[PDB]
Amino acid sequence: AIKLEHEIKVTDQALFFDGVKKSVPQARTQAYIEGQKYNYAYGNAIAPHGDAIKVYKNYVFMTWYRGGILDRHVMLTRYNTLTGKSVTIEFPHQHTGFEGRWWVGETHNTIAVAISPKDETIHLLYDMHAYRENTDTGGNGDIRKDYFRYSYSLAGAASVTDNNFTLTQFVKDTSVNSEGATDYKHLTMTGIEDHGQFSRLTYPTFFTSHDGDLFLHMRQGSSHDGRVVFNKYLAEQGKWSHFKSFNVLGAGKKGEIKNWSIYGKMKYADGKIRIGFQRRFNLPDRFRAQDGMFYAYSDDPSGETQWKNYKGEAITMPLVKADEALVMRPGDLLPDATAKDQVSITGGFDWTVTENGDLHLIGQTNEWVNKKVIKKVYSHTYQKAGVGELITTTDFPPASQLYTAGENIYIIGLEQGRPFVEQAKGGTNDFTRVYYAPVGSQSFQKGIVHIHDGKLYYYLLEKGGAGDKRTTYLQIINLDI
Ligand SMILES: [Ca+2]
Ligand SMILES: [Ca+2]
Ligand SMILES: [Ca+2]
């Protein structure tokens, strides 16, 4: 059976935004008040959040911001699964909040972490929400040479002894734009400063191939005109390739009816670089936000060429018209919801492909009437073994992410604060609960998952804390593959 193997405390000082929600004009406008609680613009929990946990050999790497409101330092912790010991590096960068207003917490601004399986370099990307050289921080720091924030290490740093796991392992900024002796933030990944390439980026998320290649993807642009870009770590050269567009910017002048923005994630799944996403058109129509459900995969191990849709048909690369990668229309789940903004798709999208080729996508599609959600529909679209008709069903529980290991797909979450695991054979919608932490165990408020070598690494926020410093834990659960 699935069993909990290890439960480890990461910190009692994880940053939490213990204030109230602010609107974007408030967050942009209001001055600091000394003694205020830590208000926020989007979510209230920046840790664990984002691409913040990775496993490499016997090490679990976890990122987080340290509390409280006056600290906010970027932190990197390494847990050694062989010794049970942890070591943590404190970086000089502090969370800059909403457009430099560091007293308003900004959950888009996550700390992503990856290890190159080839040269054991550690890569960090943090605190970014589409910034650019003329971003107006309202007097809170100069961002002209700090709009893209990248930190990286010496080769072999991933596996040094705990005593040597320090900032000494990381490479300072020594370019003409360097800020000084404690500047660890680089403005580019290629060694070439390039505002056009590295401005307006959000959502750093790394993925790794079977042969040990490391990739990154981000979203570039705005909610009205946005693309996914991705690059590859060049281990032989100690740098990254040029960003490559999965989809164009300015599609309205290149063959689409209008500009659009992309809402999804690239992953490495069943041996291929792939992407799943929904589209925001910003048309005056029945869609309050996103529309459609899309998927494509590359038969190129570098993911640069040979892109295809679910049917195996080649797609235009870079993509201009999203409909080429169509899988289904979530609008069809609410077919009488035709009034302006009556179909509200604002999240809950995910997708996976199992090691047997089974394709799975989930979505949440809400009916929006007089400024309120009046109906929530969860969908599960799947195709067994990559062939045959797509099945879309709404007989799917309220889950927001899908995971895979061996032949199965999994739903993983918190129920009454306790981790559970539901599992289904790939290519089916037949789920059964196979793990639930017992009564008397701890309660958690939030969690992020990382699946590695048949085990579930659950990076969790403990429930019930107070103030702007909370406790996080790492759980290691054997999926019994
Ligand atoms: Ca710098
Ligand atoms: Ca719309
Ligand atoms: Ca649709």
Q: How far is the CA of 189 from the centre of ligand 2 (A)?
A: 35
How many Cα atoms within 13 Å fall on the side-chain side of residue 227? Answer: 21
d(CA 77, CA 370): 46
DSSP 81: T
Ligand nearest to C-alpha 282: 2
Residues 6+ apart with CB under 8 A from 158: 56, 57, 59, 61, 115, 116, 120, 121, 122
- Tokens at 43, concatenated: 């979510």
3-state secondary structure of 251: helix
Contact 445, 45 (CB under 8 A): yes
Contact 175, 124 (CB under 8 A): no
As residues whose CB is below 5 A from the ion ligand 1, the structure lists: 173, 183, 185
d(CA 462, CA 459): 10
Residue 123: closest CA among 83, 75, 170: 170
Q: How far is the CA of 427 from the centre of ligand 1 (A)?
A: 47
**In the PDB record, what is the listed experimental method?**
X-ray
Residue 185 annotated in ligand binding:
yes
Ligand nearest to C-alpha 292: 3
Q: Is 452 a catalytic residue?
A: no
d(CA 78, CA 55): 10
Contact 66, 10 (CB under 8 A): no
Side chain identity, residue 3: K
- Tokens at 298, concatenated: 């590359």
Residue 24: closest CA among 110, 96, 98, 130: 98
> Per the residue annotation, which of 6, 108, 195, 452 is the catalytic one?
108
Beta bridge partner(s), residue 69: none
Q: How far is the CA of 110 from the centre of ligand 2 (A)?
A: 28
Residue 381: closest CA among 423, 420, 349: 349
Q: What is the DSSP string of 327-344?
A: EE-GGGGSTT--STT-EE
Q: What is the DSSP string of 432-459?
A: EEEEEPPTTS--EEEEEEEEETTEEEEE
Burial of 372 (0-12, 13-18, 19+ CB in 10 A): exposed
C-alpha distances (whole Å) from 163 to each of 57, 86, 171, 303 are 19, 10, 18, 38
3-state secondary structure of 40: strand
Residue 444: closest CA among 475, 468, 467, 398: 475
Q: How far is the CA of 146 from the centre of ligand 1 (A)?
A: 6
Residue 283 annotated in ligand binding:
yes
Residue 265: closest CA among 200, 324, 207: 207
Residue 173 annotated in ligand binding:
yes
d(CA 328, CA 295): 10
Q: How far is the CA of 95 from the centre of ligand 3 (A)?
A: 37
Q: How far is the CA of 351 from the centre of ligand 2 (A)?
A: 23
Side chain identity, residue 1: A
The kind and range of the H/E element at 29 are helix 24-29
Burial of 424 (0-12, 13-18, 19+ CB in 10 A): buried
- Tokens at 300, concatenated: 């190129």
Beta bridge partner(s), residue 476: 6, 457
Residue 183 annotated in ligand binding:
yes
Burial of 379 (0-12, 13-18, 19+ CB in 10 A): buried
End-to-end CA distance of the chain: 9
Size of the chain, expressed as the number of residues it contains:
481
Give the residue carrying structure tokens 């309205």: 252
Residues 6+ apart with CB under 8 A from 410: 402, 403, 404, 421, 422, 423, 424, 451, 479
Q: Are strands 39-40 and 104-105 parallel, antiparallel or unpaired?
A: parallel
Q: How far is the CA of 253 from the centre of ligand 3 (A)?
A: 23
Ligand nearest to C-alpha 188: 1
Residues 6+ apart with CB under 8 A from 449: 401, 403, 412, 456, 457, 458, 459
Q: Which ranges constitute the DSSP H helices of 159-258? A: 195-198
